[PDB]
Amino acid sequence: ASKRALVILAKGAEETETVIPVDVMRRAGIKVTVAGLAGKDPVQCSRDVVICPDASLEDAKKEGPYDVVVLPGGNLGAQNLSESAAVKEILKEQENRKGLIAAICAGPTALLAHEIGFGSKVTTHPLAKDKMMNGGHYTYSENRVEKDGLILTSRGPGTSFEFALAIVEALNGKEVAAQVKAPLVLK
Amino acid sequence: ASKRALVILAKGAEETETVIPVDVMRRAGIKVTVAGLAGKDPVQCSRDVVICPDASLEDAKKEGPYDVVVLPGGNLGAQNLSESAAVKEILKEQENRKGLIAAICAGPTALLAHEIGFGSKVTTHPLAKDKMMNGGHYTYSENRVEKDGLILTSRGPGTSFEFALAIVEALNGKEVAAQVKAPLVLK
């Protein structure tokens, strides 16, 4: 069966960090659900792009499990993810089932908020390092994409394609990732 | 006054090539209007991301002129742009007023359809070269971003940030482009 991804979309999310992974994962044949944190209605992203989610998170969370849970960044979007009890429950279930969790930019700070994956090596946006490192619960990395077991992190808008291809490689293998990569004209 | 950009969004557009330039241009302080070719309703992009436009093209075209007209790619989106009489009129007006026109991936093939900028050096997605070059009306380039006067072209999803920053440089200068670039964590 095809792999399945849950992308959790909150107000103030970074739209490039949302759309690039959705697009790349769909190119890889992954069944992606863009789930709105607040409900079914369109979401106003950080740079005012408005995205219509496929489902509310309330509905999508009942249709798991997912092979990957993806947390976009954007400072305000990640704060919203960090405050959500529903996100907490989803991430703890994914961690308990030994499923992949992928977060980019400010997104990894929701892992801290929900006490996920402590002891991992992680990266974030440079400006999100201090928040992520509060308490010393992770070891910091400057790699553009970082992966420590089932915790896969990345840094910013400009690492989104690399982040997404790393998700594809983890779920569908290096050959599929390479085939998806070539038509993208990445640098 | 702030510069203004018109981004023309058709069904089947490549969503990364739409969202990345909108985001980057807004980071540069440019007033961006995402205008739906078909009307005011949400647009189903090539990889099924659904974007709510700011306005219909029918309305937005009456609120010009714009400092740049931007044509995303995606094979089917570019075909829709190529078939549109409204797009033809907008591009011919922009060319006549010596305004910037920027197109990415399959997007430049709408320049061919509307007889815009013949004699320019252009790039496209590799798979769109033969369509763009039908008749020999342009000279082809493999540069990731190409600019010949007021015709600015680029190649694919993975050149979208570079394309957008080239628009910013053309409108707001190299220093603003460099300042916008740094937080993106580009490679």
Ligand SMILES: [Cl-]
């Ligand atoms: Cl942000």
Ligand SMILES: [Cl-]
């Ligand atoms: Cl396409």
